[PDB]
Amino acid sequence: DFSAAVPFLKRPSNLDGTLAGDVGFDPLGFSDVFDLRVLREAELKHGRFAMLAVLGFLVQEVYTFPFFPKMAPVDAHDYFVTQGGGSQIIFWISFVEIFGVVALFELIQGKRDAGDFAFDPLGLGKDEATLARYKVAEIKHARLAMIAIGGFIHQFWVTKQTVLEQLG
Amino acid sequence: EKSASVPFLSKPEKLDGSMAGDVGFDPLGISYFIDVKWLREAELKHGRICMLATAGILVQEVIHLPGPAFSSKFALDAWSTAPRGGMVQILIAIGLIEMVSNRFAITATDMFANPNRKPGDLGFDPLSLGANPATRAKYELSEVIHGRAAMMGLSGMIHQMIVSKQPVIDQLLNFKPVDA
Amino acid sequence: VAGLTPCKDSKDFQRRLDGSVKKLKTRLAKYEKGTPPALALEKQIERTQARFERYGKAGLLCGTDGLPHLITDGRWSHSGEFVIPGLFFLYIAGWIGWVGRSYVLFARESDKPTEKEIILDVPAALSFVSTGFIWPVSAFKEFTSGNLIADESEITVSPR
Amino acid sequence: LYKEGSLQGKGVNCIPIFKRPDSLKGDAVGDMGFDPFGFSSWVDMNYVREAEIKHGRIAMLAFAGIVVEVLGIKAPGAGKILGSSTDIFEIHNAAVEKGSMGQILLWCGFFEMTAGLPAMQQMLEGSGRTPGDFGFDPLGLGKKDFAQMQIKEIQNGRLAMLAVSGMVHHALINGKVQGL
Amino acid sequence: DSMIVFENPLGKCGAYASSCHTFLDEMGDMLKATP
Amino acid sequence: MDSNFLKYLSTAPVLLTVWLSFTAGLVIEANRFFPDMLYFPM
Ligand code: CLA
Ligand SMILES: CC1=C(C#C/C(C)=C/C=C/C(C)=C/C=C/C=C(C)/C=C/C=C(\C)C#CC2=C(C)C[C@@H](O)CC2(C)C)C(C)(C)C[C@H](O)C1
Ligand SMILES: CC1=C(C#C/C(C)=C/C=C/C(C)=C/C=C/C=C(C)/C=C/C=C(C)/C=C/C2=C(C)CCCC2(C)C)C(C)(C)C[C@H](O)C1
Ligand SMILES: CCCCCCCCCCCCO[C@H]1O[C@H](CO)[C@@H](O[C@H]2O[C@H](CO)[C@@H](O)[C@H](O)[C@H]2O)[C@H](O)[C@H]1O
Secondary structure, three states: OEOOOOOOOEOOOOOOOOOOOOOOOOOOOHHHHOOHHHHHHHHHHHHHHHHHHHHHHHHHHHOOOOOOOOOOHHHHHHHHHHHOHHHHHHHHHHHHHHHHHHHHHHHHHOOOOOOOOOOOOOOOOOOHHHHHHHHHHHHHHHHHHHHHHHHHHHHHHHHOOOHHHHOO | OEOOOOOOOEOOOOOOOOOOOOOOOOOOOHHHHOOHHHHHHHHHHHHHHHHHHHHHHHHOOOEEOOOOOOOOOOHHHHHHHOOHHHHHHHHHHHHHHHHHHOOOOOOOOOOOOOOOOOOOOOOOOOOOHHHOHHHHHHHHHHHHHHHHHHHHHHHHHHHHHHHHOOOHHHHHHOOOOOOO | OOOOEEHHHOHHHHHHHHHHHHHHHHHHOOOOOOOHHHHHHHHHHHHHHHHHHHHHHOOOEEOOOOOEEOOOOOOHHHHHHHHHHHHHHHHHHHHHHHHHHHHHHHHHOOOOHHHHHHEOOHHHHHHHHHHHHHHHHHHHHHHHHOOOOOOHHHOOOOOO | OOOEOOOEOOOOOOOOOOOOOOOOOOOOOOOOOOOOOOHHHOOOHHHHHHHHHHHHHHHHHHHHHHHHHHHOOOOOOHHHHOOOOOOHHHHHHHHHHHOHHHHHHHHHHHHHHHHHHHHHHHHHOOOOOOOOOOOOOOOOOOOOOHHHHHHHHHHHHHHHHHHHHHHHHHHHHOOOOOOO | OOOOEEOOOOOOOOOOOOOOOOHHHHHHHHHHOOO | OOHHHHHHHHEHHHHHHHHHHHHHHHHHHHHHHOOOOOOOOO
């Protein structure tokens, strides 16, 4: 059994392809010693944060609220740390993560699917076929955004230029 | 199998939906280890006290009893300016009220000893408005929701008063965003 | 006044305050203004001054040594020195003891009392902790109902 | 339903881009198979229908009022008290200052509390009242074709909602409700 | 001599576009602000 | 949470440590906000 992603690497035993975006990639065997459901929850939380971070970077570059000083996305971090808004965002993320802890415990108990918080306000995932396609799309975009946000931040640190400015 | 309020979390087992305001909201599972009767009695007491607290904070800013001691639009300042002997009298009266209304059963071990004792039912219905079965359920739900809303409102009022240092109505009419 | 002088008007107390403040100021003179050490020493000076002023106004009596002395005889003019503090203690301690005894009995009437005493039943323990707020009337009720004091013929005793 | 199956009802999709949700059963007037977000699954259909009718009626009245204000038609004596400004926002502020809008608010709220809230509550408790029905047909124009009138009212109200929103934002940009 | 005291909270304030700077006024100013 | 982990947290030393840490914090904060209280104020 070799991995579909890496022909020369054996397919990880825990990775049977059931989860979305499972191409058999786990060279370092974290799935062998850690719960794949917990790892998947971590993956989707990371990816959702990263996708929202990419969109936030772009929207902050083009537009900034009239009542907030205009600044590059990275500098806004240190600005709001002193201002107090960052404290509020952190506190409310922590408030949601308190219930995230209960969700994680239920996931360990098997009552929930990793990354499945039953959040479909607009009812876009009602039909299965579209739901599976959307799940593959979500994991793919999550990984791509996780790469892209690091790219954005590091490129800003190097060039001291926002990404939209840099692309020209 | 899943809670109505928080879909991804499972329904709290001890919350069977009999109680008014039950939407399956117990993410931390207090009901598992604490009797829901005690929890509901506590909830109703908190909500009632906060209903009265919100009403008082809003009303005693516009209407006061005669006297310099009672003349304070700011509620936290009223706490100090009102006669201390009167405040201690109120405390003693609240204690006697708790004792008699709970009929000497004021502890976690004896509060609900009588099967007739129901959570939050202290025998208080002076005008007998709750004797109508048709409206009793609606009144119970209204009381629970009012207690919850008033609890949140009182907490917000107290802390916004700490910040602004002005009454609630005065703050809303002369708002000044926080600066340090 | 009992046998000493009020501390608000004692040269010894004033001298002690002066000495403390001067020590702090000498320690402060070697630190730049606005640096964390300077701010810390300034706050120490403020705390010392506030403590001495509050002790002076409290009505505490001070001896020739310049230190406040306590009159723990029963005098109501000095109740806050021993009696009211001691009433708060007795309240808290009776609370602790009453709830502990209640939990001991609760574990006694259990499947495994020893398991309940090493691995606790914290819901019931918190129940008792809550009950402990009227421990005086509860304890007297136990006494008068006879559930507190055991009979002489029901307690083990060694041979004479 | 008037023209059921052609104008409204099951199998009607005003915008074939989005699929007619199964929740839309064609039982409600104005059902043209538009609900891409599938709110009909969870919402209370009668409540939301009454909300739609209320929004449409207010929007229609608002369109008439804004058009008269911009055209400059004023009641005898209105100009002296409020002013001669044609701008809708200036008129709103002037009327609030004088007290006109306050009285309109008071009486609209009284009507809401005494008519719309009780009627809505009974309808949601299963009185069988048609959404948006208050019996207000003094001139008897709806006796002939009540269903046709109902559909016409709903569609005219939707169009008026969109038009009023557009007019307000046009006034914001150019200073003209037309926005031409 | 000893009478309930009624103090008018509104004074001369208005919810919007008034001499008093209200919460709604703050929100409007913030939305119309210029960096 | 695992019932076995909860029983472990209910074990005597864990509860004693947590309760006494809570009490120490209570006393420390009381002395931090109301320091140098050699007497009940009367
Ligand atoms: C910050 C100050 C401070 C501190 C750190 C302590 C610390 C202590 N005190 Mg306390 N104590 C203080 C102030 C303080 N005291 C003051 C101001 C007073 C004067 C009122 C007392 C009076 C006092 C007494 C009378 C006793 C203690 C005891 C103790 C020790 C054990 C308490 C215990 O196990 O409670 C947990 C509670 C229990 C185990 C329940 C049984 C014991 C309590 C104290 C009974 C309380 C109710 C009872 C009806 C009181 C009758 C008293 C009468 C016979 C004189 C503990 C080292 C006890 C001791 O040393 O025993 C050898 C003790 O018996 N203290
Ligand atoms: C039971 C019973 C009886 C009774 C009775 C009685 C006396 C009933 C009394 C009921 C009362 C007083 C209810 C009060 C509710 C208050 C609420 C919900 C406040 C919410 C505030 C909020 C959300 C807020 C806020 C806010 C905050 C924090 C921030 C601010 O910037 C804004 C704002 C102000 C909006 C009687 C006696 C008749 C007998 C009968 O036989 C039985
Ligand atoms: C420090 C700091 C901040 C911060 C911050 C933040 C948010 C920092 C975030 C840093 C991040 C997100 C870094 C990501 C790096 C990703 C890498 C190297 C991916 C490599 C992927 C590879 C090689 C994939 C390879 C691929 C694989 C495996 C398989 C497919 C094929 C192939 C293409 C080969 C701020 C902004 C708040 C400022 C504040 O002052 C403090
Ligand atoms: C009616 C008969 C009932 C008998 C039972 C009474 C038992 C216990 C009574 C305790 C004494 C009353 O307590 C009292 O002490 C306070 C001391 O600050 C007083 O405080 C105030 O009282 C007076 C106004 O009412 C003022 O003139 C005082 O200057 C002021 O100190 C209050 O008047 C009351 O709170």
